[PDB]
């Protein structure tokens, strides 16, 4: 006979939830009513729902974290639910707040999720009730080869519960730079300054430290429990510590069930949810498949609560903050993530970090509003003639694009900046290129023939290039190491971390680059003068930075000892006022640091000496020299002395692997170019005890011609 259209309830839930258990509840409903219930778990259902809600594929009921439902309700996709007072009284009242758009309920709460304090009972049978207790506890444990506490410091989801504690921050606003946030962030950074925690501690490091028994406590959620069980750590889960007497405030996620505005069976959906799912029997079926954690239903929660871990989840959740809807949470996350990381790393003071977090949040909130309140929403989200422009100062264009999803008139991205994370050729991806092959990819795409670098690009501005290349402030931190200092006993030293520096030291306020920096194109070009590169040659350099032009009148710039002595002298002189060295001195210290820390591994020679403020290089095919290797060796080296137009000399080196009896080296300098920077020695090509000297014509370099030369 005829087909049927209102005969079924279609339910969508994510694949990581107990859908088989939910289907058992569906089977009971079907047995009782004859209405068949189909539980589906489509991939990306939370993205598909707004598209298909009104179609034949649309589900009658959708299960998801409450923080998507605001958006759904905003588009009119969810029916107002109508539970009576008796039914509302069956759930914890705070859970209903997660699904109320005021007055109106738009979903049924099912379960709640929040962070707890997790502790090792064998190291710490009585966990601390306050954050204030943690440093003394760490002192005790450090004596025994352990630490008190390790958790993910990289993500505001994990750090905000402490930062929000004082004043009990709630989302709309006070806002994020309020005095309570300053107190909490200050306490957090103090734990780092005093070595109770480490600023680079992330999720994986904290989880490994805890599950291998190295730290007494961690902060994490129910998703982390499985790995702990596997580790056989004797662990407990409990209420988060208070700060200044006030509860830590973790974000709360409430898994919720909304009813499709377009469903022709809203009353049956209500019946399924209220009288089948939200019962002890119903929640148990789902929970037995995959654990719901703490549930919104009081009667069942009181059964689950005999697992102390679940009791702890609910207690922290009742003390926490319902997570704001995704777009608000995102604006908050963007702003605060950088603040904590900058404060924790010493890039900024707590005050200035939270100050910028707040102003950044103003911008992110404004752009989020623009995204939801100006036309052509869905055409911009897939990110032509019928577009419009948003005009603002050029400093803001990338935010306008990334946050508002609108087209800025003044746009950083398309000013030839490019990036590394998406492989878009541009200045940032060229200068931070981690090998020449990558640099050549970028250069060829852009038809680069000349490179101009100054000492600012080498030093202070490199940071900006890395931020753009990585598309993120924190990600740029991997380009940097620690600090030079003089101890109170006069001993010169290097520390990976400022906090490892002895008290009363004189610290040179110049962050030294990490190994990664020295391998990038900007370093290869400006710091190493192009040494090692096959496709670039220097053709001109300007005069020295003025301070070094001046020093040269009383120091020999070719004596590394005198140069270093002079550099350290200036650095200390300025360091007493907390001022960084002059640019040329920064370069000298970068070179010195390389020779002390990284040269043994990387093997490129560099003289500790200053150099031209501005350097021009030409990009060339390079002359190819290749031949058989008769000597019993695995490498071939080529070197030449280059002299610039300032009469400074440096060494060009390149070393290649012998590949089955042959070598191939690509050389960018010629010996008859009309440029004022030129090699003043032939190339010296060495394979063991075999040494051969060669000079190259400019036509060979320009046309990439091949030279046969056996060794």
Whether residue 149 contacts residue 215, with contact meaning beta carbons closer than 8 Å, is answered with: yes
Q: What is the DSSP letter of 137?
A: H
Whether residue 182 contacts residue 351, with contact meaning beta carbons closer than 8 Å, is answered with: yes
Whether residue 432 contacts residue 423, with contact meaning beta carbons closer than 8 Å, is answered with: no
Question: What is the token pair recorded at 376?
Answer: 């052509």
What 3-state class would DSSP assign to 69?
A: helix
Q: Which residues, at least 6 apart from 111, have a Cβ–Cβ distance to it below 8 Å?
A: 254, 255, 292, 293, 294, 295, 296
Longest dimension (CA), the chain: 105
What 3-state class would DSSP assign to 605?
A: coil
CATH assignment of the domain containing 691: 2.60.40.3390
Could you tell me whether strands 8-12 and 36-40 are parallel, antiparallel, or unpaired per DSSP bridges?
A: parallel
Cα–Cα distance measured from residue 633 to residue 630, given in angstroms and rounded to the nearest whole number: 8
CB atoms within 10 A of CB 135: 18
Backbone phi, then psi, for 99, in 5-degree steps? -125, 20
Tell which residue, 207, 243, 241, 235, has the closest CA to residue 223. Answer: 207
Question: What is the token pair recorded at 524?
Answer: 């290869």
174-205 as b/e, with b when 16 or more CB fall inside 10 Å? ebbbbebbbbbbbbbbebbeeebbbbebeeeb
Radius of gyration of the chain (CA): 32
Cα–Cα distance measured from residue 260 to residue 78, given in angstroms and rounded to the nearest whole number: 5
Cα–Cα distance measured from residue 89 to residue 375, given in angstroms and rounded to the nearest whole number: 42
DSSP string of 477-515, one letter each residue: GGGB--EEEE-TTS-EEEESSGGGSPTT-EE---PPB-H
* Cis? peptide before 86, omega within 30° of 0: no
Whether residue 107 contacts residue 79, with contact meaning beta carbons closer than 8 Å, is answered with: no
Whether residue 575 contacts residue 611, with contact meaning beta carbons closer than 8 Å, is answered with: no
- 578: phi > 0 → left, psi -120 to 50 → alpha, else beta; which? left
Q: Which residues, at least 6 apart from 20, have a Cβ–Cβ distance to it below 8 Å?
A: 289
Q: What is the DSSP letter of 616?
A: E
432-456 as b/e, with b when 16 or more CB fall inside 10 Å? bbeebebbbbbbeeeebeebebbbe
Backbone phi, then psi, for 68, in 5-degree steps? -95, -20
CB atoms within 10 A of CB 36: 14
Cα–Cα distance measured from residue 420 to residue 418, given in angstroms and rounded to the nearest whole number: 7
CB atoms within 10 A of CB 560: 16
Cα–Cα distance measured from residue 64 to residue 106, given in angstroms and rounded to the nearest whole number: 12
Question: What is the token pair recorded at 660?
Answer: 């089955």
Whether residue 539 contacts residue 676, with contact meaning beta carbons closer than 8 Å, is answered with: yes
Cβ-in-10-Å burial (0-12, 13-18, 19+) of 305 comes to: middle
Whether residue 642 contacts residue 680, with contact meaning beta carbons closer than 8 Å, is answered with: yes
Q: What is the DSSP letter of 4?
A: -
Backbone phi, then psi, for 407, in 5-degree steps? -90, 115
Q: Tally the C-alpha atoms within 13 A of residue 110's C-alpha that lie toward its C-beta.
A: 26
| Angle at the Cα of 71 from the Cα atoms of 66 and 77, rounded to 5 degrees | 95
Cα–Cα distance measured from residue 67 to residue 98, given in angstroms and rounded to the nearest whole number: 8
DSSP string of 367-432, one letter each residue: HHHHHHHSS-HHHHH---TT--EE---GGGHHHHHHTS--EESS-SIIIII-BTTTTB-SHHHHHT
Whether residue 534 contacts residue 668, with contact meaning beta carbons closer than 8 Å, is answered with: yes
**Resolution given for this structure, in angstroms:** 1.9
CATH assignment of the domain containing 160: 3.40.190.10
What 3-state class would DSSP assign to 40?
A: strand
Could you tell me whether strands 690-694 and 614-619 are parallel, antiparallel, or unpaired per DSSP bridges?
A: unpaired
Q: What is the dihedral of CA 427, 590, 534, 644, to 10 degrees?
A: 100
Q: What is the dihedral of CA 350, 246, 225, 145, to 10 degrees?
A: 60
Tell which residue, 425, 517, 541, has the closest CA to residue 462. Answer: 517
Cα–Cα distance measured from residue 384 to residue 458, given in angstroms and rounded to the nearest whole number: 38
Cα–Cα distance measured from residue 429 to residue 431, given in angstroms and rounded to the nearest whole number: 6
Q: Whose structure tokens read 């140069």? A: 563
What 3-state class would DSSP assign to 64?
A: strand
CB atoms within 10 A of CB 495: 17
Cα–Cα distance measured from residue 113 to residue 486, given in angstroms and rounded to the nearest whole number: 49
Question: What is the token pair recorded at 244?
Answer: 């200044």
Q: Which residues, at least 6 apart from 1, have a Cβ–Cβ distance to it below 8 Å?
A: none
Q: Whose structure tokens read 């946030």? A: 181
Question: What is the token pair recorded at 693?
Answer: 């000297």
- List the domain range (segments joined by +) for residue 685: 616-708
381-399 as b/e, with b when 16 or more CB fall inside 10 Å? eeeeeeeeebebeeebbbb
What 3-state class would DSSP assign to 433?
A: coil
Q: What is the DSSP letter of 190?
A: H
Tell which residue, 625, 229, 612, has the closest CA to residue 453. Answer: 612
Q: Whose structure tokens read 């929660």? A: 301
DSSP string of 621-653, one letter each residue: --EEEEEE--SS-SEEEEEEEEE-TTS-EEEEE
Question: What is the token pair recorded at 59?
Answer: 């589900």
Contacts 24+ apart (CB under 8 A), 290-295: 290/16, 290/17, 290/18, 290/21, 291/18, 291/222, 292/18, 292/110, 292/111, 292/255, 293/111, 293/112, 293/113, 293/222, 294/111, 294/112, 294/113, 295/110, 295/111, 295/112
Query: 661: part of which helix (H) or strand (E)?
Result: none
**Alpha-helix residue ranges (DSSP H) falling in 576-639:** 583-597, 599-602
Q: Which residues, at least 6 apart from 682, have a Cβ–Cβ distance to it below 8 Å?
A: 640, 671, 693, 694, 695
Whether residue 396 contacts residue 363, with contact meaning beta carbons closer than 8 Å, is answered with: yes
Whether residue 91 contacts residue 296, with contact meaning beta carbons closer than 8 Å, is answered with: yes
Cα–Cα distance measured from residue 127 to residue 240, given in angstroms and rounded to the nearest whole number: 10
Q: What is the 3 state secondary structure string of 666-691?
A: EECCCCCCCCCCEECCCEEEEECCEE
Question: What is the token pair recorded at 398?
Answer: 């990338």
Q: What is the 3 state secondary structure string of 256-320?
A: EEEEECCCCCHHHHHHHHHHHHCCHHHHHHHHHHCCCCEECEHHHHHHHCCCHHHHHHHHHHHHC
């Amino acid at each position: 006979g005829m087909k049927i259209e209102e005969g079924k309830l279609v339910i969508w839930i994510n694949g990581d939830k107990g859908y088989n258990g939910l289907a058992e509840v569906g089977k009971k409903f079907e047995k009782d009513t004859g209405i068949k219930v189909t539980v589906e778990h489509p991939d990306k259902l939370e993205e598909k729902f707004p598209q298909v809600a009104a179609t034949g594929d649309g589900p009658d009921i959708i299960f998801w974290a409450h923080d998507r439902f605001g958006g759904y309700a905003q588009s009119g996709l969810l029916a107002e639910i109508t539970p009576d007072k008796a039914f509302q009284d069956k759930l914890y009242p705070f859970t209903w707040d997660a699904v109320r758009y005021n007055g109106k309920l738009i979903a049924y709460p099912i379960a709640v999720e929040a962070l707890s304090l997790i502790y090792n009972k064998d190291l710490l049978p009585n966990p601390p009730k306050t954050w204030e207790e943690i440093p003394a506890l760490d002192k005790e444990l450090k004596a025994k080869g352990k630490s008190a506490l390790m958790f993910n410091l990289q993500e505001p989801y994990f750090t905000w519960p402490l930062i929000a504690a004082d004043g009990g921050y709630a989302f709309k606003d006070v806002g994020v730079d309020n005095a309570g946030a300053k107190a909490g962030l200050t306490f957090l950074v103090d734990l780092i300054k005093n070595k109770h925690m480490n600023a680079d501690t992330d999720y994986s490091i904290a989880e490994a430290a805890f599950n291998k028994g190295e730290t007494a406590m961690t902060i994490n959620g129910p998703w982390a429990w499985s790995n702990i069980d596997t580790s056989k750590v004797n662990y407990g889960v409990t209420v988060l510590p208070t700060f200044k007497g006030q509860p830590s405030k973790p974000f709360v996620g409430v898994l919720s069930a909304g009813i499709n505005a377009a469903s022709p069976n809203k009353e049956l959906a209500k019946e399924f949810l209220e009288n089948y799912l939200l019962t002890d029997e119903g929640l148990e079926a789902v929970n037995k498949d995959k654990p719901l954690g703490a549930v919104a239903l009081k009667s069942y929660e009181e059964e689950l609560a005999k697992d102390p871990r679940i009791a702890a989840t609910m207690e922290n959740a009742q003390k926490g903050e319902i997570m704001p809807n995704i777009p608000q949470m995102s604006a908050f996350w963007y702003a605060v993530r950088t603040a904590v990381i900058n404060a924790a790393s010493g890039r900024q003071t707590v005050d200035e970090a939270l100050k910028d977090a707040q102003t950044n949040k103003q911008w992110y909130d404004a752009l989020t509003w623009m995204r939801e309140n100006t036309p052509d929403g869905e055409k911009y989200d897939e990110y032509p003639f019928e577009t419009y422009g948003v005009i603002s100062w050029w400093d803001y264009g990338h935010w306008i694009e990334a946050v508002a999803h609108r087209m800025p008139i003044a746009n950083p991205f398309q000013a030839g900046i490019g990036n590394k994370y998406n492989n878009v050729p541009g200045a940032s991806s060229f200068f931070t290129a981690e090998n020449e092959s990558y640099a050549e990819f970028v250069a060829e795409k852009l038809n680069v023939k000349y490179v101009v670098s100054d000492i600012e690009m080498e030093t202070g501005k490199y940071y900006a290039m890395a931020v753009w290349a990585e598309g993120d402030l924190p990600l740029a931190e991997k380009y940097y190491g620690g600090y030079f200092y003089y101890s109170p006993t006069g001993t010169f030293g290097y520390a990976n971390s400022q906090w490892d520096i002895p008290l009363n030291s004189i610290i040179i306020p110049l962050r030294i680059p990490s190994e990664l920096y020295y391998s990038t194109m900007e370093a290869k070009l400006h710091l190493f003068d192009g040494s090692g590169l096959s496709h670039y040659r220097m053709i001109y350099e300007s005069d020295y930075p003025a301070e070094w032009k001046s020093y040269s009148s009383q120091v020999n710039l070719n004596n590394e000892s005198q140069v270093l002595q002079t550099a350290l002298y200036e650095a200390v002189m300025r360091a007493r006022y907390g001022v960084s060295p002059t640019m040329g001195t920064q370069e000298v210290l970068y070179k010195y640091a390389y020779t002390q820390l990284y040269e043994k591994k990387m093997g490129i020679p560099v003289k500790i000496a200053p150099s031209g403020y501005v350097k021009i290089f030409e990009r060339v095919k390079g002359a190819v020299v290749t031949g058989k290797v008769s000597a019993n060796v695995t490498e071939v080296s080529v070197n030449a002395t280059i002299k610039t137009n300032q009469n400074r000399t440096f060494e060009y080196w390149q070393t290649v692997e012998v590949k089955n009896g042959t070598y191939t080296v690509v050389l960018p300098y010629s010996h008859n170019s009309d440029y004022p920077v030129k090699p003043i020695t032939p190339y010296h090509i060495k394979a063991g005890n075999v040494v051969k000297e060669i000079t190259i014509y400019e036509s060979q370099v320009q046309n990439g011609e091949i030279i046969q030369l056996d060794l």
